[PDB]
Amino acid sequence: INYWLAHAKAGYIVHWTA
């Protein structure tokens, strides 16, 4: 379980791409 190691990973497209 984790919210940072899930959202900060999948939601890491803010600096990656989108």
How many helices in DSSP terms?
1
* N-to-C span: 26 Å
Give the CA-based shape: rod-shaped
Task: Kindly report the oligomeric state of this protein.
Answer: monomer
Which sequence of SSEs, written as H and E, runs from N to C? H
- The amount of beta strand, in percent, is under 5%
Largest sheet, in brief, is: none
Going by helix content, strand content and strand pairing, the class is mainly alpha
- Our Rg estimate from Cα atoms comes to 8 Å
- Helical content class: 25-40%
In total, the number of strands is 0
PDB class: de novo protein
Keywords: alpha-helix, DE novo protein
Assembly: monomeric
Entry title: NMR structure of DP5_conformation1: monomeric alpha-helix
Account of the protein in words:
With 18 residues, the protein is mostly helical. It is 39% helix and 0% strand. It is built from 1 helix and no strands.
Characteristic key phrases:
18 residues; mainly alpha; rod-shaped
Write the layout of secondary structure elements.
Blueprint: H1 4-10
Summarize the structure.
The protein contains 1 helix and no strands. The chain is an all-alpha fold and 18 residues long.
